[PDB]
Assembly symmetry: D2
Homo-oligomer: 498 residues x 4
């Protein structure tokens, strides 16, 4: 019982030794430096995010090279993320530089490019040609991140739409426009996005944060855009609207993970419904066994302030309580005054919330929602986590090359950390988005074939000992395959470290 | 299962008709006007709050009169709350204006009043005399809402303490000093507090928000300070330090309700632990069946901004999810630019979170934690709520003169609203702090004795019909007593409304 | 948990004060005497059963008059049961008095009445004309309570059937025949049964044990046979085969109660499957809220022996554990050597099993299987039982005239006894088949109208006090209707006896 | 929920392929023949029982040799059980043949051996010397299996006791005397018992059924009497009195298994309380993970009758439902007319009850009552059973030389059978008392060392395939250890059979 658990939570009891949840930082001017990055990584940064909505290929090249330099300096594996610009619906150019609007005025939204360069305070151009046809009277239009609200009145021309202004705001040249409720037939990947993805794939980005995902087909378009060179790179779809949350089931199946992009989602859907969307998306991603990132204003006030609001602390804590693997900073680390301090605060809230969680409940809730019969790979992974709770194991060790086994072990949310012994360095950086998983690399070319699992196994137990989780005599759960049939785990064994 | 509930949450389903949670607003310059108050009350305000940390008695009666005028104009019962200044530890005067401090400096904190008017950037005065004795080396001292951190190095004088400056901050004249992790032997009620409470009991304040409650004995001191004239006024203890959370069990038993004053609590205790304190305090207050309020900066950004942060929305939602009877606005409504808009947003998050809650689980969690045998009054009230879930009752009606029965029904957190038919107007406003309850007054002198509880019963069913909760043919649970017993409810009846 | 409950069952702890389960005795030569009946009633007999398979209308008249005399002598209400002879399939007359059969022989079963009086060890007559058509080769035929098994080989004539004998047995004149698996199209009520039911209805029998019920339509035929004079008499359908257990759902809806007639059922269906049928039928009758009688060989060895077998004791105990309201003796009391002793043993096993039962589980199991929204009558009855567990009530009092309310209170299986205050004497004798219900009669013509519930209420509390369940100061749950709308209960009140 | 399970039980659904429960038969005149034994073994006998209360050593080796011959002929492993005579309290000789007693008479029970050979209907001798001292007035004495009841009135001599005859019975020479509700200080092992156990350990009996176990110290006395030659033989303690049930916890810890000897227990303790003792003892033995047998008259009527009573069928079914590893026949197979038929009926009730059981509930009930942290051996075994339910495994394979691992897997009551590949033939027969287990022997001297557990693994999968449980493509859970550890299982693997 949550009520029975809460009555008895000690504010004076010691927190957990290890940190299970992961932190994702947006690299910007405040954090592009190799010294600033070595600072974020030391504070808690597991994944470096690049927002491609702005910035040149020379800028992001510097971000790629600087994160890799800082990571190699500290001897850590950090994931490189590419947040695509995505399909945009922007306004035209405004007459003499700007145009202001007052509550009551009758404005005209035209799709004829004649009003593109010449946009007055009475009529202006919009990128979307479907616009007058898709948007029907009574319906709403949001301009400049929902700052100015427009109500559709009547269709003037086959290109124009008569609108009522009900929010006093001044619009600048080619400002963004969002259409609530309506199904937008924009491309999955824009012309820039395809060139951005090409640069990303060629430069070795670990994962892609696919901006504005509405359908599962749109996810497949992104994987196709990645090609044979980007076959193994993760696709984390960003849910930014109604079509995201409506087709969440299909988008989960198609994607490698999901991001609750509360930023654009809060502009599309009503503010109060973003909590319900968060909870729904996060729990569906847990039953699925795919990573979940929470994303906007986690600790917003710390962009200028040295301490977060009471609200910002509960938001970081409850994202972890919900079941999120990751928590995200963007602007708090990109353009913020306290870049190291904000990550340090996030880490403390994560370890606190992690300690205030009933560890057995999350496993039993996920397990009981599982379809029986389970695949032998899944029944071995869930039972490995079951054994961990039973023997009170200080750590779980998994020999996963893809990361697919480590993700299915993390799916059953254990109390202890998961150590992943892998032969691929990409896997080391891709498990930075999955909870409780701490990767170790085994160089096959520099040590041996190790067909009989024993070097990777001895490597992992040694790492867990050094990191301070397991001491001599402690019991560890070990997951791999039997010397007979490999490619999926079937083996589970309980061993004392010593 | 919370996981199974979450995976089945619709962002497109309709919200609940009634609002169960209650909203408290701090009255300030932005909201002192009778028109501004009629605006808060229309937006969602159930209780008006008066922060006695500042403001004259002439100014506080201006708000008392204006709230009473706006309430009578709209025909509503709004509770009047007195948030006491409480025992304060302030510094001395900074000679030549202000003193500035740099990380590394050796400062002196003296209890000798010789440094009271003459406080330099090397030595200054502190209100607390028992300061060098209670605070031992290694310990921390927080100046100006914890902004400046100082660590005790050595005892210089029997009045002075040699300290190390931990951060860069500029201190003003008579700024606040908080002492983390140590028992402060300050009075429960200060000299100003006693005069404030006297004015409070005189002007007919419905409830007292007792600032900085450390022990249960301290709440009895406040009740004694209220006297025979303030016997019936509610005492809501504000948990502001580590002692409040340590003796929470005893403070609950002694108080009429509790407030999680996250503001001063976040300054005393580490930021991340305020979530654990919140959850613990809120759930303990539910098992006890006593109101619990959430407070510090919930929708903070809306003081300047017309929309809240993603964090602020989840904070309001999760306070309701935790089990909070109330949610509070301090400064957002006091000095805020959008006073009506912030309350309107809070009400929308409350109704959303209220809909995303598992109706039966909260009742069964609270019921199973109660000691058996139950008192006949409690077994009637819990079974009335059990009947409400069983018959799918659209509303519960209770005849409660004190409000103790309505609080005992709200304790079992029903899905429907609770209509309280009372003979006391104080009860109408005192139940603005309890969840689901919506009071109706029965003027005994203007209608009749109603010894056979029937005029009140017909009054209540009429109110529920008009407010739109119950339609013709709907079933209602009715709680009162028979003729052979009084003072406590005995009877429960399921009636089809005509 | 059953395992957790069992570990902790004390063989030395004191048993319950009251007996919740009921005992039904078959009246025969050993128990027809007014002194023998006063002996059964004193030992535990709540219902007197008359097996109409044998015995004249003069014999059963004596049984009716003698039970009524014994009941009036002891001042108790005992139910009079009529177990109908039912549709029979009997053999013809055997040549020179008998015919024997050996494993391997080829026998002939003819439907031509030419073989009725002349039945040799090679060919004999059977009552059922559908017989050769319905019974197909490979199928089984059971003669003389399944003692001799016959396998169908081929259809010789349109009246005859060639059979293989596979059990050495000697058949007598017009011995019984049972057809396993097959659907028998016999009448619901035979020519004798209709005259028997006429005698029963006219003599005032409280209930009818309808022999060999296969369909719900067959139940309606029995109620039609009872007419306007037998409108209020209970129909307890006897499940004696495959068609009984297959259409159990429909037979439950149509009947007033059910009897697991294990006797004929064990001859029809395989012996091991009678446990599964028992458990299924008993639990379905609990969710339905209709009485369940368990019936054959409860304590068989005690027909000749003064002590039962270890098996017979677990059978009586587990019938009570399953959820049976009643347990039945037939032959153990009818022709038995120890008629008083067998009932005395049954009562001791019932009180023991009643004490070893988790009282809360049976209520919560039944309640959670209930369809929500519940009728106001049901939500008040379940919540009255919920209140009883909560306040630890020593007894529940119900004002039921039909018995329908007392049966729905007993449906939620409370820990305490249920006292039924009724205005009908038939109701007093019909609640002898429902668990925990102990009836009290209120003579309307001899005391008053009592439109305001208070005489019946004071009558009940007095009865519970005298019987020793409630002492002064004890809390009682009282169920009736509000002075406004009667005919169904809506009122529930918790009162202290004193 | 058991109620929800029951309401969904099909009397027409197919039963389980394997039989999980085990059957024990008492060898007597009806079943001593090698052909009669080959008949019992073919019908269901897993363990052969020898009642040493009667019969010479010459006669008991005749059964030892015949069971071993019949087992070797059919190629099966059957356990040889020695049910000791135990400490007996018998009367003296009745002068002139027999003595008769009538209700009301004043009899004398003397401990002076002067009345040993000369015992009249007024005074007789009793074996127990401490009888007048231990038995105090008001107390009961049971003569000839409790048939004759006598109440102590007063102490006549320091050897005699004046008693009141409670019922009419005729006593024979040297009939048994049981003393209810008092601690009998008789030896654990009698002079005959020690010589019987010596013969037992000499002829290689697999298990000892220790008659009349009072304390845990008494079971250690029996283990001491077995010596170094009988170190590995199982000690199944027979609970026969009120002390056995009082010290059940300690008797469980000390013993290798338990028998609910309902026969003598039903004579000591009241008949109705034997159900509560059964349930308690059986469930405590499940949490402990030790075998538990049910015994006295389960299918009693079948000693003379060809079909059992309705009661006898529910008794066999409910013993399996309770959690009994074994069910026993004493006299039904020893002196019975239908020895093969009774075992055949028992097997059918076992498979029926086994099918009507909730597979997962028993596992989860046992698992949740176990102390955490679990030993690595136990967490492997429980998780192996957890995996079996998850993957829907058709069989579990265990390599257990002692049998301790197979008993630990059977402890978690899986849905499928357990195949035990052992290197000891004693283990093959000792596991005939544990549920689900079906042993396979691996002759180390005739095949190889098999240090890498693979020949045994291939042996087991082959056995499961042949017996028809696992088909091609089916998944099996395999439990053993790795090379780095031995003596206890460490590994668990899920393999698809080829
Ligand atoms: O304690 P509370 O909530 O005021 O109400 C308890 C009592 O008040 C009552 O209304 C008694 O006063 P009435 O005269 O109005 O019945 C009863 O319903 C009940 O016994
Ligand atoms: O204690 P048990 O049941 O005999 O078996 C435990 C041990 O037996 C073993 O079979 C060891 O002997 P092996 O040499 O056959 O592996 C292991 O599986 C296990 O460690
Ligand atoms: Mg976007
Ligand atoms: Mg303060
Ligand atoms: Mg019949
Ligand atoms: Mg004995």
């Amino acid at each position: 019982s949550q009520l029975q658990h809460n009555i008895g939570l000690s504010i004076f009891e010691p927190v957990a030794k290890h940190r299970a949840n992961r932190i994702i930082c947006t690299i910007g001017p405040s954090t592009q430096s190799v010294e600033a990055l070595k600072g974020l990584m030391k504070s808690g940064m597991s994944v470096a995010r690049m927002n491609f909505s702005h910035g040149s290929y020379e800028y992001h090249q510097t971000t790629i090279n600087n994160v890799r330099a800082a990571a190699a300096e500290l001897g850590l594996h950090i994931g490189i993320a590419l947040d695509t610009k995505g399909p945009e619906i922007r306004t035209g150019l405004f007459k003499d530089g700007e145009a202001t609007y007052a509550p009551g005025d009758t404005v005209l939204v035209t799709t004829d490019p004649a009003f593109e360069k010449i946009g007055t305070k009475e009529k202006f151009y919009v990128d979307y040609p479907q616009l007058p046809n898709v948007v029907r009277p009574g319906g709403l239009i949001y301009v400049d991140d929902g700052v100015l609200t427009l109500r559709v009145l009547s269709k003037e021309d086959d290109c124009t739409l008569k609108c009522h202004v009900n929010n006093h705001h001044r619009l600048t040249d080619r400002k963004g426009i969002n259409l609530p409720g309506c199904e937008v037939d924009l491309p999955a990947v824009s012309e820039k996005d395809r060139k951005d993805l090409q640069f990303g794939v060629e430069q070795g980005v670990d994962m892609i944060f696919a901006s504005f995902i509405r359908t599962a087909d749109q996810v497949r378009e992104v994987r196709a855009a990645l090609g044979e060179k980007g076959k193994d790179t993760l696709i984390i779809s960003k849910i930014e609207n109604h079509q995201g949350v409506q087709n969440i089931d299909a988008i989960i199946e198609a994607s490698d993970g999901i991001m609750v992009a509360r930023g654009d989602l809060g502009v599309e859907i009503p503010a109060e419904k973003v909590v319900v969307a968060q909870m729904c998306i996060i729990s569906k991603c847990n039953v699925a066994g795919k990573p979940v990132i929470c994303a906007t204003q986690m600790l917003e006030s710390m962009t200028t302030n040295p301490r977060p609001t009471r609200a910002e602390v509960t938001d970081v804590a409850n994202a972890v309580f919900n079941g999120a693997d990751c928590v995200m900073l963007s602007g708090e680390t990109a353009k913020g005054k306290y870049p190291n301090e904000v990550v340090q605060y996030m880490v403390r809230i994560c370890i606190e919330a992690q300690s205030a969680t009933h560890d057995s409940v999350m496993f039993n809730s996920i397990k009981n929602l599982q379809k029986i019969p389970m695949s032998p790979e899944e029944a071995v992974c869930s039972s490995a986590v079951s054994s961990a709770f039973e023997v009170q194991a200080k750590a779980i060790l998994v020999l996963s090359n893809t990361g697919r086994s480590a993700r299915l072990i993390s799916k059953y949310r254990p109390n202890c950390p998961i150590i992943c012994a892998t032969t691929r360095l990409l896997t080391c950086r891709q498990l930075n988005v999955t909870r409780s998983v701490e990767s170790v690399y085994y160089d096959v070319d520099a040590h041996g074939e190790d067909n009989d699992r024993e070097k990777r196994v001895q490597l992992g137990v040694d790492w867990a000992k050094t990191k301070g989780y397991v001491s001599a005599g402690d019991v560890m759960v070990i997951v791999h395959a039997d010397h007979s049939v490999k490619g999926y785990p079937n083996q589970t064994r309980l061993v004392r470290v010593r």
